[PDB]
Amino acid sequence: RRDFLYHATAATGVVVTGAAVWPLINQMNASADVKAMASIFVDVSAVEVGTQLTVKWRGKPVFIRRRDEKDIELARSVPLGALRDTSAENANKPGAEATDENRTLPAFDGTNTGEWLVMLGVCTHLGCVPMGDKSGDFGGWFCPCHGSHYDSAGRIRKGPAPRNLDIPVAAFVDETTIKLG
Amino acid sequence: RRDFLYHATAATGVVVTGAAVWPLINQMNASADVKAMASIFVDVSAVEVGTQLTVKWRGKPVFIRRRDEKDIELARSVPLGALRDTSAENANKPGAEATDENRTLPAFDGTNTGEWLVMLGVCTHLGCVPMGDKSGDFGGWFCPCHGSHYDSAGRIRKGPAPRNLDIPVAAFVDETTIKLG
Amino acid sequence: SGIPHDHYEPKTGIEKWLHDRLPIVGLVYDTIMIPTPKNLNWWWIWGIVLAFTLVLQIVTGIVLAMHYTPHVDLAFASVEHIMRDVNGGWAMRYIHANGASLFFLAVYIHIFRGLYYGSYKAPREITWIVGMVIYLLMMGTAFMGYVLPWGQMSFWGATVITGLFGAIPGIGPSIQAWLLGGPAVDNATLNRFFSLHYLLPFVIAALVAIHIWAFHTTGNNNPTGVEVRRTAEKDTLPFWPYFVIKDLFALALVLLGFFAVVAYMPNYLGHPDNYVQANPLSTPAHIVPEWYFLPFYAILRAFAADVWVVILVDGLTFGIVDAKFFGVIAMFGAIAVMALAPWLDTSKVRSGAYRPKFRMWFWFLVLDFVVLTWVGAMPTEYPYDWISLIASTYWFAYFLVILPLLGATEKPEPIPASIEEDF
Amino acid sequence: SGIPHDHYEPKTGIEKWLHDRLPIVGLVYDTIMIPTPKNLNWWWIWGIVLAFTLVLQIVTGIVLAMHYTPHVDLAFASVEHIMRDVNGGWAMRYIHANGASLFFLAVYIHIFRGLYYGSYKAPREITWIVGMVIYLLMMGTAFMGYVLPWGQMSFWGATVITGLFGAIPGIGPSIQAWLLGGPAVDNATLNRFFSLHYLLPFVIAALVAIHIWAFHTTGNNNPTGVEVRRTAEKDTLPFWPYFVIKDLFALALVLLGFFAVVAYMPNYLGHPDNYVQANPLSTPAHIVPEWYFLPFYAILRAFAADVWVVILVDGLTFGIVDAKFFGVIAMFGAIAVMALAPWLDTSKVRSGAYRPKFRMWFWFLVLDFVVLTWVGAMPTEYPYDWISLIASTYWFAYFLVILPLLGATEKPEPIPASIEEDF
Amino acid sequence: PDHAFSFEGIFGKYDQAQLRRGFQVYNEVCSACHGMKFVPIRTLADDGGPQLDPTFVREYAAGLDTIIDKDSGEERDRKETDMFPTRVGDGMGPDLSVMAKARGGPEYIYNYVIGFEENPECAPEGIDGYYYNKTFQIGGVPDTCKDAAGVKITHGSWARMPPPLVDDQVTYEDGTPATVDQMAQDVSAFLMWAAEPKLVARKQMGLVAMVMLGLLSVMLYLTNKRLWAPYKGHK
Amino acid sequence: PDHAFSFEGIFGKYDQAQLRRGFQVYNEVCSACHGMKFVPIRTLADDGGPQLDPTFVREYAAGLDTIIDKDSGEERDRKETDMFPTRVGDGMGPDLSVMAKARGGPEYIYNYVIGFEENPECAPEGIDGYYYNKTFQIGGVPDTCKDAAGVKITHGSWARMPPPLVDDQVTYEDGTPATVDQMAQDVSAFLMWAAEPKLVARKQMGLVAMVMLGLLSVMLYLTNKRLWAPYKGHK
Ligand code: HEC
Ligand code: HEC
Ligand code: HEC
Ligand code: HEC
Ligand code: HEC
Ligand code: HEC
Ligand code: FES
Ligand code: FES
């Protein structure tokens, strides 16, 4: 029939066109050489605890910074109230409250948390690198792209950045190493 | 006047157009990163005449070797007969016979030829680098890629290599220098 | 009326055998002897400026691409190879880089000329639509291009102006990764941008093709709310040679100033930090993307829930429309509303030379544009936040409410007849 | 006669407000409902094939350029990155590489269809000129492109097909150096070729624009020596939907065969030596540039002063016209004479379906083309030299002398009237 | 007869046990001189070929040579993301990444590895440092074996590679007679993988496309026959 | 006053003696830590700047560090065609190729090299391993010198570079008082050369183009005034 045959030819043409177009839009997706996206062993190795440590990975920096008591007490003295993001972005654990006890890090294979904190050095606003070394209006990190003030533990404050600095999955290698991935 | 003014405006437009076009045709010419390549010099400067001298250029080595009497006499005692390539590949002169008098080199700006010989250290078979320092079955160069025996003056012998070792265009710089290009 | 004067191909045998391919018919009848009014001021030149600038950019780029190598390890080096070894080098690069500046400066005056003399008003909607489409294409182009030198500002500008697409929910990260070629910026992004950057200009030329086709079919706007009175039209001198020569004179002046800049003040409009190689591990202070995107950058980074007029706390009613998404929508709307204008101005009138209130509001709009330009560079600390909020609010207010109210109660002026204004 | 049927924009308000930009008027009146005769065989499809192939090549290339890195040290590696990592990879490359083959195959049939049915005869000269211009552009394009992989055949093909320009005296070496970016081949040549290779296709599209404009203004040839009898023309059905569907059917078949090749016989038309990296120090045996340049390669390397019909010993009268220059002139002339044809055939007649002697000579010409194709690959040793000389001589003889003699004494046939051939 | 492989045809998606055997052979024999830079190690887990266990891949990678770095010069642990090593000179050979395409290809490798017999009865002395092959055609030939105009009278020529394998060079874990011929076939298939890993996807795409386009073409033929009916009915 | 250079204006084609002095200092002082990879050694003969004698250039090149190769790993002779060396880490600094543009530029270098005075009377102890500079603004500051909201009360900050020169560090062959200020000016000019070598050509092109375009524009103005005369005469 007129209608059936004509419309079916059109439908088949459309289907073939789409099957030909899809790969032109698929090739731009992540290739296999980008699929890898594996881990990294960074050795703390006497980093002069208290200043900072940065390492490249996945194309972004991974901040490994020891803790300075004044920085710590400022951290542990932050009630969940008045905290923009209270989710503790760290993916090594569940959505537990953004508390310093959970938010600092694993305990060297021992039992302590208020001494090391390794987070992803990527501002959640649009992905800039905040400046460290005690900066901003909260004694933490300051993003120069738009002015986002981070706190000691990395939770976002005073700016457009919606959430704190995430924490990748990482465990220790028996007191001198870090495993990123 | 009508004619003068109109034609002069047209002429000025044309002149400006040409002054703007010329560089468009100039950028395609040799950039500065390439000029420093056409002209390369090699300061011989007491190379302990008789062993060898090699220098990189154009991505291939340029062999500058002094002459050892035994090597010389073996050279000058080679009749054109039984010589695979009798063309004297050297491009600093015409297709004159591959004779040692023409095949050795210019004469320091003086008058002598049986003392220096600079050829392109590239086997004519497929472009390997023959080993020097008196090697092979003819007291010259030996190609390890397929076994081509070169002679004292560089003429091919005993192998698949069809022709001898070419000689680039080179002149002297008054008794201590060589100009390659 | 609309005298095309096809020339009837009566010249000679050459002009008679050309009846195979009409081409000269087109040129003569339409694109050279196009009747244009006499009442044209010096604001109707910038289109010639834009066409010439586009040709210039295309040419210089085709030349640079003969020496630029798209790769993280060889881009900077190739740029220096250009500025040092190549014969002309610095000229091509400075002419390419700065000419973009002139291009955008010229489109700004081209656009604001339009808003004044009702060039968006009917029957000239298609031209406006095509022009906004172009503006978008050329913004994207310049963005893709600022990245190629792989300096320091390149990296971070790309980072943020791609995190935008990732702000939105559900389909943000996917688009981000599909655009960057990966999670973050690297050589893949560079290749995409180079290709794309080397392709869109031709689309722009075609769109310019339609841009020129439209306003030849539709008469050029004129300082007055009047048409060429087709019904024989003693007004409306032709384009060639009169307006051609006028535009070429202005263009010569503009190129004179442009080359003076190129030769004495070339690094003025640039960011020095783009002369240091990239470090994904260190961000400089005051990225300040560029100067032709500061308005929208400010409209973006203004809404942050930091004012009593903060509509973000109210938009939080829906848990999905956070701040970032709100700013992105605000920017896209800042442009979409400018595109929608011709269907918002409810006035059966024309050029604001006979609408005073419109004059005042329009000059306030120009001032707002300049202010936004100056604010995108300054931090988000008090008082600049209030300023940016006020300016964005006025932009939206103008384009949404102000024009209807005028179209209602804005006719205290005697309109001029007889486009032949022999004053 | 020549019914354009502009549609009068009577559809509705949408088709009436489109009086701002005519565009749909153009499409409908001209480029869709273009009266074409009924007498069309299956040889009038290859233009659609060429247009589609051009689009295909442009698209696939724009995709590849997102992963190809023009540099001697990173081209091969990027090509392998494509064929291995990228999602589609091999497809794009094989479709790009082979589609060039189909492109040239299709232009060959497009051209020889033309020589038979007097499509170069008046009043269709402009189409012929434009087509030869295109042919030149696309040859140069394919040449620039075969170089980009920086294999082994790339290098040496470039070397020789650039030494050509250097053969000529006085201005040979200068042009050679200005084209290679230096004395010999290196990255500079690669950048030039990539840019150029990424730019000419658009010029080709424009030229295709004029190509299509011409034969719409000038009626499509038709199997016979007759026109559409404009004065109403019961003959000359429209293009859409009839011929559109016919061409699309043939195109589907052609793409079917093409993809079967791509998927089973992709490396067949290629040279394996292009899969080994380049060595400027070692040349392989039987460079054999490609298969769409062998005719002219043979016409070039035929004249060598090695036959009693050797006109080089006679051209040596002038000490400047040596052999090399003679072969180069012979090739340029092999093309220039094909372009000059329409002013050499002195016949007030048309398609060789009514000119027998012309049929015989034309089939001999096709055979000569095939022979030249087969000879450019075989050495210059006896007997192939005599064969190449004979074939080139016949090519030139046909195009110079044969057509005049026919036009003189070639009308023993009853021409058909009434292009409505209801047989 | 010709000992056709599995992939030689419209089907034959790279029987994988053959490829694992070729891998046992390549890493223990050919790797001593040859390399495959154009080949990432992670491909030993991608489908189509040897779908080995990733952990074994990481182990085998760390057990290879040291590829230093691209940013900070320091001998790393050679992670799978890197490429196979490269043996370059001083008694070494070319790269086998795509040698299966730079020559019907794999049959060349099979009939090359196969064939290193003693020197014939024209030049039994042979050559010092060079060994004889019956199929390589790009090697030197002594003057004693050439004809009157330089052409060789031997089937093959003299190759610089020594005989790679003896009667029972290695053991197969699966259980199989590891004679020279089976090893040659297996390694040829492995190299063909290293060169064309996306073969099976090629064939499946070809099938799908042939089918869809045959369908489209048939439908268009029907449409054409229909439209052109009232004009081709009286004749 | 501001100690303007020669090139600071519409003229000033890089007084070359100043650049030779800056070179004497750069290779003997700054080269110990800094590098200029973006600078070929063959530019010390190109016009515009130091038009030194090529032979001295080849000597000075061969007398530098060893840049190995790109094809065959082997420590060569560091031919001029190569680029200046690179000092990368372990107590070293950035590259000075284009530092004269990544900051009015050279005045930054002058007023930076100029100024390393002792620690002020807010933190006289200072810092261990860091030294104080009047004009660097991107360095750390002790908490004793910061205000109530993190801003520094010092003019400059603490830079990791030590004082590069004393009262009379080197001799000038031409004959000139080699105090610190003259050396600073000279080296600033040398770096500006290394960054903008094609300055003088820039200025000459600008002059030529301004002239030609003024001429063209005047002629077009006359043509316009003429053509538009019969329409602007009665009013
Ligand atoms: C050194 C002891 C080698 C080992 C072990 C293997 N190969 Fe090799 N190979 C080697 C050299 C020096 C050469 C060059 C030979 C020449 O005359 O140029 C080769 C060459 C090959 C080739 C290419 C043959 C050609 O036609 O060019 C192939 C296909 C090849 N070799 C295969 C191969 C395989 C499969 C091996 C492991 C079983 C192997 N070779 C080992 C040096 C050495
Ligand atoms: C090591 C002993 C050095 C020598 C000798 C010189 N420089 Fe240097 N420089 C050095 C370091 C470690 C740094 C980094 C300082 C920091 O705090 O990051 C620098 C920096 C510079 C700069 C950049 C300043 C800036 O604003 O970033 C300049 C312009 C500079 N140095 C100039 C310079 C000159 C001209 C020298 C020779 C006279 C010189 N330096 C020597 C290390 C060392
Ligand atoms: C044929 C290629 C090509 C075309 C067409 C082209 N450019 Fe570019 N563009 C380049 C290259 C190459 C670079 C990098 C070299 C450079 O920065 O000068 C570049 C860089 C840029 C830069 C950064 C300049 C710098 O030095 O940082 C801008 C801005 C830019 N392009 C804008 C544009 C715009 C806007 C257009 C047209 C609408 C355009 N370009 C047309 C090739 C081109
Ligand atoms: C967003 C708006 C917009 C943009 C961007 C734009 N145009 Fe226009 N253009 C207009 C309008 C409106 C007119 C007035 C048409 C009329 O008067 O009929 C116009 C008119 C013109 C004219 C004729 C009269 C004049 O003003 O000179 C030219 C030529 C022209 N444009 C060229 C260009 C070119 C070239 C570009 C870009 C490369 C461009 N325009 C970009 C909207 C735009
Ligand atoms: C947008 C870019 C682009 C366009 C348009 C384009 N190509 Fe290419 N072409 C490439 C790239 C990239 C390569 C190198 C990668 C490759 O060889 O597949 C290439 C390579 C080639 C090759 C060698 C193929 C091979 O694998 O050795 C040929 C032949 C070729 N092009 C011909 C053409 C012709 C003919 C046209 C149109 C008339 C065309 N190309 C259009 C980008 C393009
Ligand atoms: C050197 C000659 C030549 C070349 C090359 C050429 N054409 Fe043509 N083309 C012709 C002639 C002659 C005609 C017949 C015109 C007529 O019958 O009025 C024609 C007709 C056509 C037609 C309409 C009738 C037909 O034969 O299909 C199309 C469509 C077409 N060409 C497209 C193309 C495209 C697309 C290209 C290249 C990408 C191309 N041609 C290359 C000479 C050429
Ligand atoms: S990007 Fe980090 S705050 Fe804007
Ligand atoms: S390559 Fe020199 S002899 Fe074979």
Q: How does DSSP assign chain E, residue by residue?
A: -----SSSSS-----HHHHHHHHHHHHHTGGGT-B-TT-BGGGGTSTTS----HHHHHHHHHTS-----SSS-------TTSB-----SSS---B-SSTTT----HHHHHHHHS--PPP-TT-TT--SS-EEESS--SSB--TTTB-TTS-B-SSSEEESSPP---SS----SS-----HHHHHHHHHHHHHHHH-TTHHHHHHHHHHHHHHHHHHHHHHHHHHHHHTSTTSS--
Which chains lie within 8 Å of chain E at 3 or more CB pairs, if any?
A: A, B, D
Residue boundaries of the structural domains of chain E: 1-103+166-197, 117-162, 205-235
- Three-state SS for chain F is CCCCCCCCCCCCCCCHHHHHHHHHHHHHCHHHCCECCCCEHHHHCCCCCCCCCHHHHHHHHHCCCCCCCCCCCCCCCCCCCCECCCCCCCCCCCECCCCCCCCCCHHHHHHHHCCCCCCCCCCCCCCCCCEEECCCCCCECCCCCECCCCCECCCCEEECCCCCCCCCCCCCCCCCCCCHHHHHHHHHHHHHHHHCCCHHHHHHHHHHHHHHHHHHHHHHHHHHHHHCCCCCCCC
Q: Can you read off the two tokens belonging to residue C67?
A: 């020496």
Per the CB < 8 A criterion, the answer to whether D396 and D303 are in contact is no
Whether residue B162 has a cis bond before it, omega within 30° of 0: no
Find the largest Cα–Cα distance for chain C: 78
| Residues comprising chain E, all counted | 235
Amino acid of residue B155:
R
A90-A93-A95 Cα angle (round to 5): 75
Residue boundaries of the structural domains of chain D: 1-423
Question: Residues 22..81 of F with a Cβ closer than 8 Å to B: which?
Answer: 40, 42, 46, 58, 71, 76, 80-81
Residue boundaries of the structural domains of chain A: 1-31, 32-181
Measured between CB atoms, which of C23, C126, C199 is closest to D62? C199
Q: Can you read off the two tokens belonging to residue B21?
A: 């076009």
3-class DSSP state of C360: helix
Q: Can you read off the two tokens belonging to residue E182?
A: 């089976």
Chain D interface mutation, best of B25, B40, B58, highest count of D Cβ atoms under 10 Å: B58
Find the largest Cα–Cα distance for chain B: 88
Q: Can you read off the two tokens belonging to residue C408?
A: 């209602």
Q: Can you read off the two tokens belonging to residue D387?
A: 């064969």
E19, E23, E34, best to mutate for ligand 1 pocket (most atoms within 8 Å of CB): E34
User: Phi and psi of F95, rounded to 5°?
Assistant: -95, 135
DSSP state of C100: H
Say if residue C209 is exposed, middle or buried (CB neighbours under 10 Å; 0-12, 13-18, 19+).
exposed
Cα(A50)–Cα(D240) distance, rounded to whole angstroms?
Answer: 78
Please provide the DSSP assignment of D39-70 as one string. ---TTS-HHHHHHHHHHHHHHHHHHHTTT---
Cα(C180)–Cα(C193) distance, rounded to whole angstroms?
Answer: 9
Nearest CA in chain F to C266: F202
State the residue for tokens 């009839």: D242
Cα(A159)–Cα(A147) distance, rounded to whole angstroms?
Answer: 6
Mind telling me how many Å the CA of A3 is from chain C's nearest CA? 36
Q: Do E227 and D241 touch (CB under 8 A)?
A: yes
Q: Does B148 sit in the ligand 8 pocket, CB within 6 Å?
A: yes
Pick B1-31's CATH classification: 3.40.250.10, 1.20.5.510, 2.30.110.10, 3.30.420.480. Answer: 1.20.5.510
Q: Do F103 and C246 touch (CB under 8 A)?
A: no
Q: Do F215 and B59 touch (CB under 8 A)?
A: no
Going by their DSSP bridges, the two strands B178-180 and B170-172 should be labelled as antiparallel
Q: Can you read off the two tokens belonging to residue F185?
A: 């000016």
Per the CB < 8 A criterion, the answer to whether D95 and D60 are in contact is yes
- The residues near D179 (Cβ < 8 Å, ≥ 6 apart) are B28, D162, D165, D189, D192
- The residues near F171 (Cβ < 8 Å, ≥ 6 apart) are F178
E strand intervals along chain A: 40-42, 54-57, 60-66, 116-120, 131-135, 140-143, 148-150, 156-157, 170-172, 178-180
| Angle subtended by helix axes C90-116 and F199-227, to nearest 10 | 40
Closest listed residue to residue C258, CA positions, set C96, C68, C42, C134: C96
Q: Can you read off the two tokens belonging to residue D398?
A: 């046909």
A140 bridge partner residues: A135
Per the CB < 8 A criterion, the answer to whether C403 and C346 are in contact is yes
Top CATH class of E1-103+166-197 equals mainly alpha
Measured between CB atoms, which of C90, C248, C422 is closest to F198? C90
Nearest CA in chain D to B59: D280
Distances (CA, A) of D377 to B125, C412, D141, D271, E151: 22, 85, 22, 12, 21
How many CB atoms are closer than 10 A to CB B95? 11
User: Would you say A146 is a known binding-site residue?
Assistant: yes
Long-range contacts: C228-232, Cβ < 8 Å, 24+?
C228/C2, C228/C35, C228/C37, C228/C419, C229/C419, C230/C1, C230/C2, C231/C1, C232/C1, C232/C3
Amino acid of residue E102:
A
Enumerate the residues of chain F whose CB falls inside 8 A of the CB of residue B59. Answer: 71
Helix and strand numbers (H, E) in chain D are 16, 0
Closest listed residue to residue C395, CA positions, set C295, C293, C313, C288: C295
The H-or-E segment that residue C238 falls in is: none
A156 bridge partner residues: A150
CA atoms within 13 A on the CB side of B90: 25
State the residue for tokens 């990155």: D81
Closest listed residue to residue A150, CA positions, set A65, A84, A64: A84
DSSP state of C180: H
Per the CB < 8 A criterion, the answer to whether C107 and C208 are in contact is no
Which chains lie within 8 Å of chain B at 3 or more CB pairs, if any?
A: C, D, E, F
Cα(D366)–Cα(E52) distance, rounded to whole angstroms?
Answer: 56
B1 in reach of chain F (CB within 8 A): no
CB-based burial, A146-172: b 16+ in 10 Å, e otherwise: bbbbbbbbbbbbbbbbebbbebbebeb
Cα(D239)–Cα(D36) distance, rounded to whole angstroms?
Answer: 6
Cα(B28)–Cα(B38) distance, rounded to whole angstroms?
Answer: 17
State the residue for tokens 């002779």: F77
Query: What is the CATH number that goes with domain C1-423?
Result: 1.20.810.10
Nearest CA in chain B to D182: B30
3-class DSSP state of B170: strand
Cα(C185)–Cα(C166) distance, rounded to whole angstroms?
Answer: 14
Q: Does C342 sit in the ligand 4 pocket, CB within 6 Å?
A: no
Measured between CB atoms, which of E198, E205, E217 is closest to D256? E217
Cα(B75)–Cα(E24) distance, rounded to whole angstroms?
Answer: 54
Q: Do E130 and B147 touch (CB under 8 A)?
A: yes
Alpha-carbon Rg for chain F in angstroms: 24
F102 in reach of chain C (CB within 8 A): yes
Measured between CB atoms, which of C84, C253, C275 is closest to F102? C275
| Residues comprising chain C, all counted | 423
DSSP state of B133: E
Measured between CB atoms, which of D179, D183, D188 is closest to B38? D183
Cα(D255)–Cα(D267) distance, rounded to whole angstroms?
Answer: 17
D243-D246-D249 Cα angle (round to 5): 150
Per the CB < 8 A criterion, the answer to whether B100 and B107 are in contact is no
Alpha-carbon Rg for chain A in angstroms: 23
Closest listed residue to residue C355, CA positions, set C118, C38, C120, C43: C118
Cα(C259)–Cα(C244) distance, rounded to whole angstroms?
Answer: 22
- The residues near E233 (Cβ < 8 Å, ≥ 6 apart) are none
Cα(E130)–Cα(C216) distance, rounded to whole angstroms?
Answer: 80
Q: Do C63 and B29 touch (CB under 8 A)?
A: no
Which chains lie within 8 Å of chain D at 3 or more CB pairs, if any?
A: A, B, C, E
CA atoms within 13 A on the CB side of A154: 32
User: Phi and psi of D292, rounded to 5°?
Assistant: -100, 10
Cα(F203)–Cα(C115) distance, rounded to whole angstroms?
Answer: 40
Find the largest Cα–Cα distance for chain D: 78
Cα(D306)–Cα(D327) distance, rounded to whole angstroms?
Answer: 13
Per the CB < 8 A criterion, the answer to whether E133 and E151 are in contact is no
Q: Does D116 sit in the ligand 6 pocket, CB within 6 Å?
A: no
**Among the options A16, A21, A146, A181, which is catalytic?**
A146
CA atoms within 13 A on the CB side of E11: 0
Q: Does A128 sit in the ligand 7 pocket, CB within 6 Å?
A: yes
State the residue for tokens 């991505």: B59
- The residues near C14 (Cβ < 8 Å, ≥ 6 apart) are none
3-class DSSP state of D357: helix
Give the A:C interface size as CB pairs under 8 Å: 77
Enumerate the residues of chain D whose CB falls inside 8 A of the CB of residue B38. Answer: 182-183
Distances (CA, A) of E56 to E39, E53, E78, E197: 17, 6, 14, 20
Closest listed residue to residue D288, CA positions, set D374, D388, D201, D167: D374
How many angstroms is it from E198 CA to the middle of ligand 5?
A: 22
Say if residue F230 is exposed, middle or buried (CB neighbours under 10 Å; 0-12, 13-18, 19+).
exposed
Question: Residues 122..181 of B with a Cβ closer than 8 Å to F: which?
Answer: none
Mind telling me how many Å the CA of B151 is from chain E's nearest CA? 18
* Backbone CA torsion sign across B147, B153, B155, B158: negative
Per the CB < 8 A criterion, the answer to whether D389 and D300 are in contact is no
Is there a catalytic annotation at residue A7? no
C74-C275-C202 Cα angle (round to 5): 65
Q: Do C324 and A54 touch (CB under 8 A)?
A: no
Cα(B12)–Cα(F217) distance, rounded to whole angstroms?
Answer: 10
Per 3-state DSSP, chain A is made up of helix, strand and coil in percentages (nearest 5) of 25, 20, 55
How many CB atoms are closer than 10 A to CB F171? 9
Mind telling me how many Å the CA of B164 is from chain D's nearest CA? 14
Cα(D190)–Cα(D171) distance, rounded to whole angstroms?
Answer: 23
E strand intervals along A67-162: 116-120, 131-135, 140-143, 148-150, 156-157
Cα(D403)–Cα(D338) distance, rounded to whole angstroms?
Answer: 12
State the residue for tokens 């880490």: F89
Closest listed residue to residue C207, CA positions, set C139, C142, C130: C130
How many CB atoms are closer than 10 A to CB D99? 20
Q: Does B149 sit in the ligand 8 pocket, CB within 6 Å?
A: no
Alpha-carbon Rg for chain E in angstroms: 24
Cα(C77)–Cα(C59) distance, rounded to whole angstroms?
Answer: 22
Closest listed residue to residue E197, CA positions, set E42, E9, E2, E28: E42
Alpha helices in C117-186 (DSSP H): 125-146, 153-167, 172-180
B142 bridge partner residues: B131, B149
Name the residue with the closest Cα to ligand 4, atom 21: C47
Per the CB < 8 A criterion, the answer to whether D295 and D372 are in contact is yes
Active site residues of B: 146
Cα(D98)–Cα(D291) distance, rounded to whole angstroms?
Answer: 12
Going by their DSSP bridges, the two strands B140-143 and B131-135 should be labelled as antiparallel
Q: How far from each other are the two terminal CA atoms of chain B, in whole angstroms? A: 58
Cα(D414)–Cα(A19) distance, rounded to whole angstroms?
Answer: 52
Name the residue with the closest Cα to ligand 3, atom 32: C142
Cα(F185)–Cα(F173) distance, rounded to whole angstroms?
Answer: 17
Q: Can you read off the two tokens belonging to residue D252?
A: 């589907």
Cα(C300)–Cα(C286) distance, rounded to whole angstroms?
Answer: 16
* Atom in ligand 3 nearest the alpha carbon of residue C146: 23
Cα(B168)–Cα(B92) distance, rounded to whole angstroms?
Answer: 7
Whether residue C383 has a cis bond before it, omega within 30° of 0: yes
Find the largest Cα–Cα distance for chain F: 86
Q: Name every protein residue with a CB atom under 6 angstroms from any ligand 2 atom.
A: F 25, 29-30, 32-34, 93, 99, 109, 112-113, 136, 139, 159-162, 164, 187
Mind telling me how many Å the CA of C155 is from chain A's nearest CA? 10
- The residues near D137 (Cβ < 8 Å, ≥ 6 apart) are D200, D203, D204, D207
Enumerate the residues of chain A whose CB falls inside 8 A of the CB of residue D95. Answer: none
A154 alpha carbon, distance to own chain's centre? 11
Q: Do B23 and C67 touch (CB under 8 A)?
A: no
C49, C125, C211, best to mutate for ligand 4 pocket (most atoms within 8 Å of CB): C211
Distances (CA, A) of B116 to B66, B85, B105: 5, 21, 6
Q: Do F219 and B56 touch (CB under 8 A)?
A: no
Closest listed residue to residue D243, CA positions, set D7, D44, D9: D44
E strand intervals along A17-130: 40-42, 54-57, 60-66, 116-120
Q: Does E161 sit in the ligand 1 pocket, CB within 6 Å?
A: yes
For chain D, give the residues followed by a break (C–N over 2.5 Å). 231
State the residue for tokens 């992963």: D67
Distances (CA, A) of D344 to D399, D405, D406: 8, 10, 11
Q: Can you read off the two tokens belonging to residue D186?
A: 């290196």
Enumerate the residues of chain D whose CB falls inside 8 A of the CB of residue C210. Answer: 21, 23
Top CATH class of B32-181 equals mainly beta
C197, C262, C267, C268, best to mutate for ligand 3 pocket (most atoms within 8 Å of CB): C197
Please provide the DSSP assignment of E155-200 as one string. SSEEESSPP---SS----SS-----HHHHHHHHHHHHHHHH-TTHH
- Three-state SS for B39-106 is CEECCCCCCCCCCCCEEEECCEEEEEEECCHHHHHHHHCCCCCCCCCCCCCCCCCCCCCCCHHHHCCC
Q: Do chains B and A touch (3 or more CB pairs under 8 A)?
A: no
